[PDB]
Design a protein around this ligand. Structure first.
Ligand SMILES: CCCCCCCCO[C@@H]1O[C@H](CO)[C@@H](O)[C@H](O)[C@H]1O
Ligand SMILES: CCCCCCCCO[C@@H]1O[C@H](CO)[C@@H](O)[C@H](O)[C@H]1O
Ligand SMILES: CCCCCCCCO[C@@H]1O[C@H](CO)[C@@H](O)[C@H](O)[C@H]1O
Ligand SMILES: CCCCCCCCO[C@@H]1O[C@H](CO)[C@@H](O)[C@H](O)[C@H]1O
Ligand SMILES: CCCCCCCCO[C@@H]1O[C@H](CO)[C@@H](O)[C@H](O)[C@H]1O
Length: 257
């Protein structure tokens, strides 16, 4: 229902309650990073043996809690996005997990149809976001945001802007805004079945930021081959103030569209 429209999709009712809805992309890639941040995870007794090659995966689902809460084509929904970095090959340390980032959202979303000279604004979503890595001190990190997510598409292009405003406790990382900025821009281009994507955040004041380019292509109707290159600050929470360049290759289910 409208290529890449999270909200329109959530409005589509499923006959099976266990058929969930995709929020963000879902994938699993084998990666190699330029620098593995041992400093921040020094507390760990495997830190020394930390390898730069990790299994990286992302899980992202949405659950409509209440359709039509604010008129038709509206929904009160939640989503769960998890990103994990895993020392799978690091057998010498019993394949530890370096970092996981738990990111649940609660939001009011609308499926819309506004014209922008070719573009159609399809999603307008507003909600609360919480992002933490479930760690005890000192490696603990977390922050909360109120955000708005906007998505417009024009032919082969998709654009999504997600500005936010920080709320709650930031003591695990009080300077996180320095590296993350105030929004996230996402762009997707459809070249036939090939999907090119870019996702980043950039504080125009401090010069810090991070980017993520991706290219995918269908292996089957449900699964795709996915190549990713991340470069910059803020890849994960434990590396929010750490800079690295990371390349990975793996499988993917849904891309942004
Ligand atoms: C697949 C297993 O699950 C993993 O278990 C780990 C255990 O610590 C967690 O840190 C990860 O977040 C979780 O994805
Ligand atoms: C900023 C708060 C979000 C506003 C989106 C609420 C969804 C209302 O719905 C919108 O109503 C418009 C009528 O003006 C129609 O032109 C749009 O197609 C429709 O999506
Ligand atoms: C646009 C509608 C927003 C729906 C998101 C639900 C947010 C409820 O979440 C609450 O938000 C408060 C914000 O001041 C925080 O102080 C609370 O800790 C948080 O639990
Ligand atoms: C619909 C278009 C929304 C685009 C979101 C970009 C907003 C980010 O704008 C930021 O706002 C901060 C608060 O004033 C300023 O301190 C920063 O300098 C500025 O970059
Ligand atoms: C970054 C994505 C660049 C997309 O660029 C597009 O490529 C198309 C295919 O060659 C051209 O037809 C379009 O004119 C061009 O804008």
């Amino acid at each position: 229902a409208v290529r890449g429209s999270i909200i329109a999709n959530m409005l589509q009712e499923h006959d099976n309650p266990f058929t969930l809805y995709p929020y963000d992309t879902n994938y699993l890639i084998y990666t190699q990073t330029s620098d593995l941040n041992k400093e921040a995870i020094a507390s760990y007794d495997w830190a020394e043996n930390a390898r730069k090659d990790e299994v990286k995966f992302q899980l992202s689902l949405a659950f409509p809690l209440w359709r039509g809460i604010l008129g038709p084509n509206s929904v009160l929904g939640a989503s769960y996005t998890q990103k994990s970095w895993w020392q799978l090959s690091n057998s010498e340390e019993s394949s530890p997990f370096r970092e996981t980032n738990y990111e649940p959202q609660l939001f009011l979303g609308f499926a819309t149809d506004y014209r922008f000279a070719g573009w159609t604004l399809r999603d307008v979503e507003m909600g609360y976001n919480h992002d933490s890595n479930g760690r005890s001190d000192p490696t603990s990190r977390s922050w909360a945001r109120l955000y708005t997510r906007l998505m417009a598409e024009n032919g082969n292009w998709l654009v999504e802007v997600k500005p936010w405003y920080v709320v709650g406790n930031t003591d695990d990382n009080p300077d996180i805004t320095k590296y993350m900025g105030y929004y996230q821009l996402k762009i997707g281009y459809h070249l036939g079945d090939a999907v090119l994507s870019a996702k980043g955040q950039y504080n125009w004041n401090t010069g810090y930021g991070g980017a993520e380019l991706g290219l995918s292509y269908p292996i089957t109707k449900h699964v795709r081959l996915y190549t990713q290159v991340y470069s910059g600050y803020g890849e994960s929470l434990i590396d929010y103030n750490f800079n690295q360049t990371r390349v990975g290759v793996g499988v993917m289910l849904n891309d942004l569209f």
